[PDB]
Amino acid sequence: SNCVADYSVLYNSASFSTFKCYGVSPTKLNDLCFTNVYADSFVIRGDEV
Amino acid sequence: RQIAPGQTGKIADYNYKLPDDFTGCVIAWNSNNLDSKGNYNYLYR
């Protein structure tokens, strides 16, 4: 909260196997503003992702 | 998996792209028999 979010750095990173987005398009994220993000963090087997 | 109408990905927006209403077929096959060497002469943008 209370901060500015350049998603280009994340989306252009080769570090990621997936970037699937379910009510917004990842190309358009920089053209959005919203109340809160909430980031949820954990680890699993790849076969379960 | 990116070669579909309206897909987006590290290939399917930065270079090649199919129309958002396409009519056609996509056909692919494994080629590690012949195109592997590694072979750096295959490139993307």
Explain the overall architecture.
The structure is cut from a larger assembly and holds 2 copies of chain A. Chain A has 49 residues and is mostly loops. Helices cover 8% and strands 0% of the residues of chain A. Chain A has one helix spanning 8-11. The longest helix of chain A has 4 residues, at 8-11. Chain A is globular and about 35 Å long. The PDB classes it as viral protein. Keywords: SARS-CoV-2 Spike Protein Trimer, viral protein. The entry is titled "SARS-CoV-2 u1S2q All Down RBD State Spike Protein Trimer - asymmetric refinement". Chains A, B: Spike glycoprotein.
Provide the succession of SSEs of chain A.
H
Which percent band covers the strand fraction of chain A? under 5%
| Structural class category of chain A | little secondary structure
Q: Quaternary status of these chains?
A: part of a larger assembly
User: Please, how many helices of chain A?
Assistant: 1
Organism (chain B): Severe acute respiratory syndrome coronavirus 2 (2019-nCoV)
Protein name (chain B): Spike protein S1
Region (Immunodominant HLA epitope recognized by the CD8+) (chain B): 39-45
PDB class: viral protein
Question: What distinguishing features does this structure have?
Answer:
8% helix; globular; viral protein; 2 chains; SARS-CoV-2 Spike Protein Trimer; little secondary structure; 1 helix; part of a larger assembly; 49 residues
